[PDB]
Amino acid sequence: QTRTYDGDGYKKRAACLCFRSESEEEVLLVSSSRHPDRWIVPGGGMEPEEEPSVAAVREVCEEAGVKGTLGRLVGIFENQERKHRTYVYVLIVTEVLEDWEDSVNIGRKREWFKIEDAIKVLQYHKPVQASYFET
């Protein structure tokens, strides 16, 4: 995996808000790779020349083991402290795979959260990810 960057040196990333249905009431979070007791929004680095929507879908397959119907771009979110900029899309989950790349390789977990609970668990370590749900 080759990391890529915007012209200002921020790492380029993409992520999806993986909703259980079109109602957008429950979202799938995954565990942090290094701190299994924490939750994050699945996402990761864009590859060279990779469209952000393609990266987002690829990352959620790898990290969360789901596929679905890609929806709208929510926004582009900067983490000033960590110097990265993430394109965040809606994805409506239609397939949940039982063994997926990060489960097998690093024991990553996934869990469904009501939106307000997702915001709560993201706030302390991932306040920018909590802000994905603001609108």
- The residues annotated with a catalytic role in the active site are 62
The span of 29-37, 64-72, 93-101, 112-120 binding ligand I7P (CB under 6 A) equals 29-37
For the chain, the helix, strand and coil percentages under 3-state DSSP, each to the nearest 5: 25, 40, 35
User: Alpha carbon 67 to chain centroid distance?
Assistant: 13
Q: Is residue 44 near Mg ion by the rule CB under 5 A? A: yes
Chosen from ligand I7P, Cl ion, Mg ion, none, partner binding at 12 (C-beta under 5 to 8 Å by type): none
Q: For the chain, how far is it from start to end, CA to CA, in angstroms?
A: 32
How would you classify residue 114: left for phi > 0, otherwise alpha for psi between -120 and 50, otherwise beta? Answer: beta
**Residue 2, both tokens:** 């080759």
Measured from the CB atom, the residue of 35 and 104 that comes closer to Cl ion is 35
According to CB under 6 A, which residues from 79 to 98 bind ligand I7P?
82, 84
Q: Which residues bind ligand I7P (CB under 6 A)?
A: 1, 3, 11, 13, 32-35, 40, 43-45, 59, 82, 84
